Symmetry: C3
Subunit: 387 residues, 3 copies
């Protein structure tokens, strides 16, 4: 509504760098279409998980499969307000697809906003639309951007972002917060009431998407967001799980990106936060056995403060006993816990639908992030206005 954005997808694009923008932009009220040359709506793109394990370069792994919702060569550029270019290993080959470069050129002339991250810039270079343009990218793309005539801004840190009129660029997904806020501002958006402090309850093997997307999305808004995990210091990292359906009766499990806690668990002053968020995956099942974690949940529910849990997150809510006489949804399987917890089941159909019950927001699976964050914003007083 009011704004429509087009994301340029491709095989092996960085998981994070495609889903975070796809869902955040939606949670803010922007329609988003995803396309990939030679593919139609409903088709799938494999994705890459780029991370660092102590080598001179990043290590790669397979992320979730990403389904396109729009068809390439059937898109009317005139009908889009902005364009986003994901990173990973897709730009490398997309940057050499005639129809892709023609598209980025055409859009580039309209003067409309273009947000490119990591290796995405390579496409910009091929289209030769960066001359004299200030900009940044993954350190490795610098030679190509300088040779393209760009005003290269070396990324001293993974988070640095750069703007030059309608050209927004980022080095890595660590800069998603600012990357996204700028593309929003660039779309004529205004964010209000975003001066909140949210606490995320994390743990080992939490769902990759279910942590990153909600987390960064809330950061792009401007909130101060912290994440903790029992027995871990503000530097520790948590391994994540990538849950996806690949044909069998239940989802499959694969290693995702490594997540970094921001605060120490022991030094946690719950009263200082305006909200609490619980990611799903396999972490909730063991976090729910933790006394300290439960008390934290109790405090937020007692204070009638906003609480947003997704997927298996509700397992911690049911164990806190805070679901009694409460309406909510969860991952289809954890309906067991909701009922046993004393809550009233809300059918999660479609799977992307989330529900609000007073101070309680719940989601079923990662496909519900748009409504998930959107409804947590409402309980927070955060709005995003355009036109």
């Amino acid at each position: 509504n009011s704004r429509t954005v087009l994301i340029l997808c491709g095989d092996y694009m960085e998981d994070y760098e495609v889903m975070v923008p796809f869902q955040a932009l939606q949670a803010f009220g922007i329609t988003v279409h995803t396309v990939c040359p030679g593919k139609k709506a409903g088709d799938s793109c494999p994705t890459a998980v780029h991370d660092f394990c102590g080598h001179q370069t990043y290590f790669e792994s397979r992320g979730h499969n990403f389904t396109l919702n729009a068809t390439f060569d059937e898109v009317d550029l005139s009908k889009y307000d902005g364009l986003v270019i994901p990173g990973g290993r897709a730009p490398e080959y997309l940057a050499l697809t005639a129809s892709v470069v023609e598209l980025v050129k055409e859009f580039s002339r309209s003067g409309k906003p273009i947000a490119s991250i990591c290796h995405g810039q390579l496409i910009l270079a091929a289209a030769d639309t960066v001359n004299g343009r200030k900009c940044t990218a993954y350190a490795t793309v610098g030679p190509s951007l300088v040779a393209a005539g760009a005003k290269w801004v070396e990324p001293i840190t993974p988070d640095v972002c750069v703007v030059d009129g309608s050209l927004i660029t980022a080095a890595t997904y660590e800069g998603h917060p600012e990357f996204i806020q700028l593309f929003v501002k660039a779309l004529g958006g205004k964010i209000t009431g975003a001066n909140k402090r949210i606490l995320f309850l994390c743990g080992d093997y939490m769902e990759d998407y279910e942590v990153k997307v909600p987390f960064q999305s809330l950061q792009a808004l401007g909130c101060q967001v912290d994440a903790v995990c029992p027995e871990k210091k503000a530097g520790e990292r948590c391994p994540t799980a990538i849950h996806d359906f690949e044909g069998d009766q239940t989802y499959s499990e694969k290693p995702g990106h490594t997540f970094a806690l921001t605060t120490n668990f022991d030094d946690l002053v719950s009263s200082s936060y305006d909200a609490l968020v619980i990611p799903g995956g396999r972490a909730p099942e063991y976090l729910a056995l933790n006394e300290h974690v439960l008390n934290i949940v109790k405090e937020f529910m007692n204070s009638e403060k906003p609480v947003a849990s997704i997927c298996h997150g509700q397992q911690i809510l049911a164990a806190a006993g805070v679901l009694k006489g409460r309406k909510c949804t969860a991952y289809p399987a954890v309906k067991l816990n909701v009922v046993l917890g004393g809550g009233t089941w809300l059918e999660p159909d479609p799977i992307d639908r989330c529900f609000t019950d007073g101070n309680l927001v719940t989601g079923a699976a990662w496909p519900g992030h748009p409504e998930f964050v959107s409804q947590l914003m409402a309980l927070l007083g955060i709005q995003v206005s355009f036109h």
Copy 2:
């Protein structure tokens, strides 16, 4: 034969939690039917390898594909003497399948024996059949059971087992030995002659099933089982291999569960054992180059004591020269090893058929575990009797 048990399978059930009971029980003269809702006999289910590597929860990878030998919608519960519920991530979604809960309800009413392990209990909680019943499960399931009115027994160790009449529960597959024996006694079985000490010759990359299945089946019988490996002590652990036939000309390989040795290899004495078991996999080929390992094999052989090796295990035997003028079978490829070793080949058809020559029991692949353990029991004079 005399009893018939039913195993409730599902996609991503714990590989060990299904294969060990499925094969140990057959080894004890019990017919076992495997079924999964929405699937027929001959279909397969992917399994999960749940293990620990230091994180706050278990790690997960894909195990062997498990082929069901029964059909769900064609089952008559009035024909089974018992029911086994394996763990993994299957209980989670099976618990929310109306037909599954109905089967547990009815089996629950008949009062016949029900053995549930790890996450399996979640199904019992769903069917509301644990009210006032003592029982245990993976610590994580504790909450759900309590809310289902169960008398919860927290697992202080990974092998704790509970029994409240016809209900038998275990926390992890590390409790299989007692889990199975209790299930057998509940079916009215009596085990006699299990006053034996057995020695296992392990090594890195031995087959996953080919170690745990025989090792745990023997323990469930009551035997004392020791496992060793050159240059490794009691606490040490060996990486295992998961060999499975996918669509190629030979089997593929994946990591299996890590296996824990029980005794220091140097502190051994062939004297104190009544039989020697040799797992297959890739451990044999290099184990067969070890002096000490060969002497151990020789001692057991000329002492005429019972010796059982499956799959590639027969390589150690050939290298020890103890297959001189003897009949035996092995993984098809190891026929060269048997012949060049001076043995007479026995066609491994069907793949689950094992052969006993004098004091020597041999099998082809892991599917022959039932006949393998059965035949080893026969040389040890161990028996299981019902009715």
Copy 3:
């Protein structure tokens, strides 16, 4: 022409043990046919990546799919001058395939050369064609050869090779250089003018084939070859990447073999070395950012010395500005870097062809190694003559 060789392939053969000879022999003017029982030209076999990681035996991983260029049951064994038998897990089941054992025996009967490595020797043992023959193989294949009546040579080190008239044998791929040379001489081939020092610019996640095949082909030729990596000692190792197309719009990625460096990067002296080789994969993009790396490339190019780059290696040339007014090809996607670098693009069609622009040799991908090496050989004046 002059010589034609047949290579016995099989599912799960060692990836290196097939590509290195398959390609190195073609770069030496020898026609090579790959064949696998029950498979026809155009079919493919999965390969296996073997090497140690701190365990008692090797670890296995999946390597590149290998497509056969000939049909087994259509081979006129009479028109072949030599036979190569790769290792890995394939021999194990091939040794038990009648057609295969007869082919081998029929070939050992003609006196013609037979090069076998690692586990390949098991096939010779099955054919009983090694009596009183001096030879070596992978340590665990010794007991079999001894029993087949061979004069076993324990591989004191992994790089040992043994020649006994027409039977050339090696223990591991580490001995490929000597292995290939001996086979070539035994084919009546002479190598002249190979006294050259060659430098390889290596890094983390370079294409597995792209470093090993060219590296070892030049070593077999007699050249002294060094491998370096920024800030890494002679003992350090580099992880590699296996890039392969599996159906998506761009290649996929798996871990390959670890590659050890030969000299220290800091003590490197560009003065020596007659040529420079730059492997592809993901290492270039980050090496292209290293000042030191660009100087080395600078030096060579100024000296007019032969420079050979393949796949993504050109990203380093382009960055050093040495493509200015040079004609060359590269991996399709990296055309961007070639054009931005001021070079004239040479279309890599067919994918396996390379080009020579003065002192510059460039290839598109690993499928082009044959022309890649023969063209570097031409600049260096190295020749292989037969008849």
